Structure 1
Amino acid sequence: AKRTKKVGIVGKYGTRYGASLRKMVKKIEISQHAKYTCSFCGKTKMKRRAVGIWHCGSCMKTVAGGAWTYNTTSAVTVKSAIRRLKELKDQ
């Protein structure tokens, strides 16, 4: 059934650490444990091994990514920057 109303995974901390830190930390604690679709094989199997390390359960392929999320916003934009700069420099 619906076990908790508003607290999700952060129910494991109970009445500790203050509402607003426990509201804040739920946004990171979902994504760091979420399973992502592997770009290489397509299987929804990418898991976080350590800090900024991501492993496919099927492909046996390790990716250096963001600490909590697989793709950081700052690392998507920079790959689009380095591509455009490679194009608009070497021409």
Structure 2
Amino acid sequence: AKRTKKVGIVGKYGTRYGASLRKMVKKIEISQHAKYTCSFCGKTKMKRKAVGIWHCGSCMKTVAGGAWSYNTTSAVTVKSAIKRLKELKDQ
């Protein structure tokens, strides 16, 4: 089962593009092709169609997310900021 030691998914690139570059795409290619849990149907089927496009194969929900992840840290920080900025308006 353990066929590679360090490369893992970036073993498809062989000895090309450099070690630090192959290490950089590794963290992203794992998250890019990862099956995320859908926050709408609960099933783990949120796969990426294109950049910022994440679709579920069960509830047919398409979400505008990040390029390599379902949601970037800059979005959850803004969503938490916009949430508290809306609470200070009604009062």
Range class of TM-score, shorter chain:
over 0.9
Q: Which runs of 5+ in 2 are unaligned?
A: none
The separation in 2 between residues aligned to 1:82 and 1:41, in whole angstroms, is 25
Aligned to 1:24: 24
Q: How many residues align?
A: 91
* Post-superposition CA distance 1:26-77 (Å, at most 9, x none): 0000000000000000000000001100000000110000000001000001
TM superposition score normalised by structure 2: 0.97
Q: Which runs of 5+ in 1 are unaligned?
A: none
The separation in 2 between residues aligned to 1:88 and 1:9, in whole angstroms, is 47
The separation in 1 between residues aligned to 2:89 and 2:55, in whole angstroms, is 35
Cα displacement (A) at 1:90: 2.2
Q: CA RMSD in A?
A: 0.6
Cα displacement (A) at 1:88: 1.2
Aligned to 1:82: 82
